Symmetry: D2
Subunit: 216 residues, 4 copies
Amino acid sequence: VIKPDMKIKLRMEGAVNGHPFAIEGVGLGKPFEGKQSMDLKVKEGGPLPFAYDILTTAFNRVFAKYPENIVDYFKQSFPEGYSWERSMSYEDGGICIATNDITLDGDCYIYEIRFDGVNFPANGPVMQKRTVKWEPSTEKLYVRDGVLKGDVNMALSLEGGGHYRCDFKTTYKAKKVVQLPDYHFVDHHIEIKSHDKDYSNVNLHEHAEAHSGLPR
Amino acid sequence: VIKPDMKIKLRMEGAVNGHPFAIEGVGLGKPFEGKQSMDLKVKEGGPLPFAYDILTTAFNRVFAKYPENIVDYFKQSFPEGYSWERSMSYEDGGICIATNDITLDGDCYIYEIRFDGVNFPANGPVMQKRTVKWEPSTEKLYVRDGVLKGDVNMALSLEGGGHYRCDFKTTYKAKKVVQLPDYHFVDHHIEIKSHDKDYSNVNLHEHAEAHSGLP
Amino acid sequence: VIKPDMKIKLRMEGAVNGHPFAIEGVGLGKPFEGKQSMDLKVKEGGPLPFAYDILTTAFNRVFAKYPENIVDYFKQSFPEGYSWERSMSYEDGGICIATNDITLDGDCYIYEIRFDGVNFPANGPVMQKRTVKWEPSTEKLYVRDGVLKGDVNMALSLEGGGHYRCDFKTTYKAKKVVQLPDYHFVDHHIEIKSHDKDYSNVNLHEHAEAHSGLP
Amino acid sequence: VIKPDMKIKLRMEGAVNGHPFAIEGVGLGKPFEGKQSMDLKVKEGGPLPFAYDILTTAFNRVFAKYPENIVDYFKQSFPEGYSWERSMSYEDGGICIATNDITLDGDCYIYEIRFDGVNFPANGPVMQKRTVKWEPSTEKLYVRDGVLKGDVNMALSLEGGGHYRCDFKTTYKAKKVVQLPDYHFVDHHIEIKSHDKDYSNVNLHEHAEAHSGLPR
């Protein structure tokens, strides 16, 4: 049920600082190559009055290249699928939380995403749209209470230099019993490859690969 | 346009650990006495698989008794009203965030509430429904960036003793220009007065009073 | 063995952002009235390159007025005494941690204090010495694992208005078995009454009172 | 002033939950190989009533292998040296903070370390000594206010499975003006290679290598 080429359809509904928005996307990815791409359109709440970048990691670790020697929690979970829950705590007190319920219909993954954020300062980099991109990162994954956790300290690069930090904590929950992996890592890189002026239209790419870190 | 007795209608839509739910409420309160009560009904997602208590502070500081010597940000904001944004960070890593948009229709406040929480551990007191009540508390309120902030370290009492801590951070935003207050406090006390077995029906009370502290 | 008037001697050794310092103090207080004062002198590391205010809460809850209806963990612990451990997490990522070991010699409490802080930004209000005073506050106290916990969200007022928040988490540990109290509060107010230009010499006051909250 | 083989002498003084201790160490490392090792002896406060593992990352990024294409803040800082300040926030509310002032005398680095920790629960993995080792990790490094920051979400493996998380935030401060690097990573792995029963004697090794993460 996992093919080398898969399709993606998503809808995100959410709010930031109380202002509602919705986004839909269609994309495709290569589960065994750890690559995916997507075209996204703002359907409600546009033009978004906050940095689009805070949304992009919400738009599926199935699309991570896993080696033979590491248990792949995500690929095992299908056809039933899995869901995730995530908090994103920014250094200036802004906080977002999101969830994705991921199902499979034929060769198309369907994401139902909810995203909510609060307490972003009016003069902060998020509401003033001064973010440039996410730096690449390494997520740490480990088992807790029979489910899988993923943590990572991320950073947005800012216009005119400097970085803006965010601590991500994710819980991933398979919809059926699956084999549990040992502690491992997923390196990833997410990139807006193109966008129009107010980000109503966005082409988004991600590359991700699991590994076991420095040996000995 | 603020009367001694006012009505309340609310809808909350939300999710905890990805589990969607919705609650409706009707109540009434006394803005100048700092009291309010309401009846709440789970309309979707019932029976709620998490402690009801995490929701109750989301179910309006206009219902706080303010003395003459303290600027009342909330009462000033009407008829236009105000909105709030809040994060609630629990000591075991559970996080909720909520927003309320509050408007006025005649004598009736209307709340549009959104509530979301994630990362509550399966074995923790929230998902295990081991909470008893919120202890009384005191919110600290202060101005930042031309809007009003409210912070408080809250605690839930737990079944079989002990407490479970949660740090609240709220931003309040008037829909019009109002006078901004100096640093002050709001003491409050929130109580579920009655409920049925699975909390499908709940009668909720709050009492709150602003003050300027210890000399 | 607790008298209406008691003396205090302390030494604090510490470091902020890796910069070592040391302070000595002599003072006196009134355990049953919940008042205390003291004179403090920087002995090493002067002139301190950070806001003095971050240190003052480290410079003893025995000097809190407890009513009859609340168990007094602190007064019970003497003559053996008690110790405390505390973290202070500021909103800009600055972190301090402190410990005090408190003993009794005749009529004189002796404090051995250690204080350390890191990650205060160069441009932040602590390293820029832009703090004015701590606002009055209310500590929440409650039992966990047979010892007493104290939590409070504190705020420093800043020069030119605005506030700077800090979350306090303390653990208090009696040196002997004592009666454990129920959930309660300690209101307190701490003030630098006088100081010289670079805070080499400081006269510090505190007033504190326990209570059970809002009904 | 940077040699392929360098010596290390350190003293750490500190307290955990108010109980004071002191440790001294002698070791050596290979700055260009990103390898170092050390023998440590508890001089005061033994036998330590808490997990030794909380101390080990306090016992110098000079010993990280840096590629040509990444600015090496640490090697540049010598002979004058640099200092660091660090907070370590554990998921059960335990908190440690430490500082190291690092100087150079001939071919020997001298570390003066202070370490303080509080609010470790009596029944937690630290006071009950149920930690096994630190998992390998990837530190994220970036410039802020003209100094270098390093953040990483770390994890201790626990006896009988499971992990215990800790968020590290470090500030590194060169003692002279040096070139500032772009955002980068340092993968590392720290290991107690041998110890006696109560950890009075410990042989500690670390391997570390800088890189720039996933490309494109």
